[PDB]
Amino acid sequence: SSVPSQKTYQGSYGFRLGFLHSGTAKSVTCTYSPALNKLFCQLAKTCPVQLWVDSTPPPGTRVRAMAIYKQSQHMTEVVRRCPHHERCSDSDGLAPPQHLIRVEGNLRAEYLDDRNTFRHSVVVPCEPPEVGSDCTTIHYNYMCYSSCMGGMNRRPILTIITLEDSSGNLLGRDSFEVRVCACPGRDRRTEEENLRKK
Numbered sequence: 001s002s003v004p005s006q007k008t009y010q011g012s013y014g015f016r017l018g019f020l021h022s023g024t025a026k027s028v029t030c031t032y033s034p035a036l037n038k039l040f041c042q043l044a045k046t047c048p049v050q051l052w053v054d055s056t057p058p059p060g061t062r063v064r065a066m067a068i069y070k071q072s073q074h075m076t077e078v079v080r081r082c083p084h085h086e087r088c089s090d091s092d093g094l095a096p097p098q099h100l101i102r103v104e105g106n107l108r109a110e111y112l113d114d115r116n117t118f119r120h121s122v123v124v125p126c127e128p129p130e131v132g133s134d135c136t137t138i139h140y141n142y143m144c145y146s147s148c149m150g151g152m153n154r155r156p157i158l159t160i161i162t163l164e165d166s167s168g169n170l171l172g173r174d175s176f177e178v179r180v181c182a183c184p185g186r187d188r189r190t191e192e193e194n195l196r197k198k
């Protein structure tokens with residue numbers, strides 16, 4: 001399959017992501033490394049991702065998430081749940097069981113199987129921050145481990161977040177690597193130390 005762009009693009013509205021500072025304790029379930037631009041999270045646990053803009057986008061703007069393989073030798077392969085997890089009957093009533101990325105707690109989430117690339121994505125309406133908040137947060141879930149045999153099978157992935165108009169045209173783009181693993185805090189510490197030693 002052709003490869004969706006991963007180029008960072010703030011666009012007219014100054015679109016970019018933000019992440020909490022969750023630390024690296026052994027018990028943490030989701031933690032983001034700015035040094036690696038990499039999110040580490042446990043299977044099916046809440047991943048808060050912030051959306052920031054410098055100016056207000058139009059009504060009907062949407063926010064799409066899609067996963068691709070990071071390594072060039074795998075980027076053309078569709079990222080999907082493994083043969084076990086696609087059959088484990090953990091449906092939330094909305095997400096197709098094949099989709100790796102879900103949006104949690106948003107009844108307006110829509111799930112796309114692209115008729116040409118076969119790639120999966122989940123899209124929600126863009127919403128302004130709640131009163132008293134400075135940004136909007138989407139809660140994502142990743143529904144397979146990076147290690148799942150027959151699926152990601154240890155290959156690193158990226159999540160691409162696109163801000164879109166009501167037709168699906170590009171308004172902004174950002175991205176981050178993801179590792180879905182049992183101990184995100186330890187793995188973040190290990191990978192950050194590996195980077196320093198490099």
Ligand SMILES: [Zn+2]
Binds near residue numbers: 081085086
């Ligand atoms: Zn799996």
